[PDB]
Chains A and B, each alone.
With several copies, the nearest count.
Chain A
């Protein structure tokens, strides 16, 4: 669960590979379940360079790319718990109150 999709539900390869040293984590409504009759209406997805102090994230029904920029973690991947990523659930999050920010 929780990793970049290798294939879309129509059986076609997802035609995108990540950069040399970037961790990615991806979450959707119905997990890994390629049951040929489901519809994931949403996604929540995040990336960090293993060596970067920023984790970047977006969801289905949002504009912008939202970051956190905690100088603390610098050698982690988004699989680690202490990164404050957007896990399974909270997948739409059309709004953000006080946690992450890209606006002014």
Chain B
């Protein structure tokens, strides 16, 4: 509308364009880690189930 109105908008667009976007890197690597430790604690039950069938842990591959 008025030149002064178009001077507040550009003064607010500048504000709302920098709101300290956080580093969402550590908060995701923790999920990837806790998939692998879960997966290992599960894998152990398969190994120690298979031993109590065969008196041996499985052959590799």
Contacts and interface: CB of A to CB of B under 8 A. Distances in A.
Contacts, number: 121
A19 B40 CA distance: 10
A1 B59 CA distance: 9
Interface residues of A, number: 52
Interface in A2-37: 2-10, 12, 14-16, 18-22, 24, 26-28, 30-34
Tier of interface size on chain B: 20 to 34
A54 interface: yes
Contacts of A48: 36
10 pairs of A and B residues whose beta carbons are closest in the complex: A5-B58, A16-B46, A52-B32, A49-B32, A40-B57, A8-B50, A8-B58, A54-B33, A39-B56, A49-B36
22 contacts: A5-B59, A7-B58, A8-B59, A9-B56, A12-B53, A16-B46, A28-B59, A34-B59, A38-B56, A40-B56, A41-B56, A47-B37, A49-B35, A52-B35, A55-B36, A56-B36, A56-B37, A57-B40, A58-B40, A60-B57, A65-B37, A65-B41
